[PDB]
Motif scaffolding. Structure first.
Motif, PDB file in Angstrom:
ATOM      1  N   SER A 116       0.830  -1.189   0.000  1.00 12.75           N
ATOM      2  CA  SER A 116       0.000   0.000   0.000  1.00 12.75           C
ATOM      3  C   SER A 116       0.871   1.249   0.000  1.00 12.75           C
ATOM      4  N   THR A 117       1.762   1.354   0.989  1.00 17.17           N
ATOM      5  CA  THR A 117       2.653   2.491   1.115  1.00 17.17           C
ATOM      6  C   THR A 117       3.418   2.713  -0.182  1.00 17.17           C
ATOM      7  N   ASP A 118       3.704   1.628  -0.907  1.00 19.49           N
ATOM      8  CA  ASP A 118       4.427   1.710  -2.161  1.00 19.49           C
ATOM      9  C   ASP A 118       3.722   2.678  -3.100  1.00 19.49           C
ATOM     10  N   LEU A 119       2.569   2.255  -3.630  1.00 21.63           N
ATOM     11  CA  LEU A 119       1.762   3.057  -4.535  1.00 21.63           C
ATOM     12  C   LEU A 119       0.293   2.887  -4.178  1.00 21.63           C
ATOM     13  N   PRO A 120      -0.571   3.695  -4.797  1.00 17.32           N
ATOM     14  CA  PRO A 120      -1.994   3.640  -4.534  1.00 17.32           C
ATOM     15  C   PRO A 120      -2.580   2.337  -5.061  1.00 17.32           C
ATOM     16  N   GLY A 121      -3.643   1.860  -4.409  1.00 15.92           N
ATOM     17  CA  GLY A 121      -4.301   0.632  -4.807  1.00 15.92           C
ATOM     18  C   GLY A 121      -5.432   0.315  -3.839  1.00 15.92           C
ATOM     19  N   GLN A 122      -6.174  -0.761  -4.112  1.00 14.84           N
ATOM     20  CA  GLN A 122      -7.276  -1.161  -3.260  1.00 14.84           C
ATOM     21  C   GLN A 122      -6.738  -1.575  -1.897  1.00 14.84           C
ATOM     22  N   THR A 123      -6.583  -2.888  -1.692  1.00 17.83           N
ATOM     23  CA  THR A 123      -6.075  -3.457  -0.454  1.00 17.83           C
ATOM     24  C   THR A 123      -6.656  -2.779   0.781  1.00 17.83           C
ATOM     25  N   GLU A 124      -5.890  -2.809   1.875  1.00 19.44           N
ATOM     26  CA  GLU A 124      -6.277  -2.194   3.131  1.00 19.44           C
ATOM     27  C   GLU A 124      -5.000  -1.847   3.882  1.00 19.44           C
ATOM     28  N   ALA A 125      -4.030  -2.763   3.829  1.00 25.47           N
ATOM     29  CA  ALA A 125      -2.742  -2.581   4.465  1.00 25.47           C
ATOM     30  C   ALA A 125      -1.767  -3.545   3.804  1.00 25.47           C
ATOM     31  N   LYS A 126      -0.550  -3.077   3.507  1.00 30.69           N
ATOM     32  CA  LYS A 126       0.447  -3.906   2.854  1.00 30.69           C
ATOM     33  C   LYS A 126       1.862  -3.400   3.113  1.00 30.69           C
ATOM     34  N   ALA A 127       2.152  -2.170   2.673  1.00 27.17           N
ATOM     35  CA  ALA A 127       3.476  -1.580   2.787  1.00 27.17           C
ATOM     36  C   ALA A 127       3.661  -0.743   4.047  1.00 27.17           C
ATOM     37  N   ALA A 128       2.575  -0.332   4.705  1.00 25.78           N
ATOM     38  CA  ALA A 128       2.675   0.492   5.895  1.00 25.78           C
ATOM     39  C   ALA A 128       3.533  -0.183   6.954  1.00 25.78           C
ATOM     40  N   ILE A 129       2.929  -1.085   7.730  1.00 23.14           N
ATOM     41  CA  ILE A 129       3.596  -1.823   8.784  1.00 23.14           C
ATOM     42  C   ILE A 129       4.504  -0.987   9.666  1.00 23.14           C
TER      43      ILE A 129
END
Length: 129
Positions: free
Chosen positions: A61-74
């Motif tokens: 997610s933090t990487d680039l915009p997209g659906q998901t909910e959480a991915k790159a944040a952490i």
């Protein structure tokens, strides 16, 4: 049609550790002996699971915009993230230990440590959602 296989499996890994927490919080409340043992079982499954095997080239997610909910944040590089992993395990194996030892206070406090451990992780990836 993302069909995130690696992520999906990770979803399972979340249900696993998340199962220890659930069965842990209920057993924590209405404990006795039978529940704790069962939670421990789910625990061990999570403990010896293999955290570092479903957290990688996901959505980010933090990487680039997209659906998901959480991915790159952490918030915590592969190392720090790896830490919480082991940490969760600390509660994982220690909680099961209390299960066998029959230390309901040990399994409640240990599992709560895992509670704030896993929770802490989510609290880290305070994604938007």
């Amino acid at each position: 049609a993302d069909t995130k296989e690696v992520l999906e499996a990770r979803e399972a890994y979340f249900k696993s550790l998340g199962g220890s927490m659930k069965a842990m919080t209920g057993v924590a409340k209405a404990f006795d002996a039978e529940a704790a043992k069962v939670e421990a079982a789910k625990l061990e499954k999570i403990l010896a699971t293999d955290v570092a095997p479903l957290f990688p080239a996901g959505t980010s997610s933090t990487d680039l915009p997209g659906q998901t909910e959480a991915k790159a944040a952490i918030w915590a590089n592969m190392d720090d993230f790896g830490a919480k992993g082991k940490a969760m395990h600390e509660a994982g194996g220690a909680v099961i230990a209390a299960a066998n030892a029959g230390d309901g206070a040990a399994f409640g406090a240990a599992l709560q440590k895992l509670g704030g451990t896993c929770k802490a992780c989510h609290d880290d990836y305070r994604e938007e959602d």
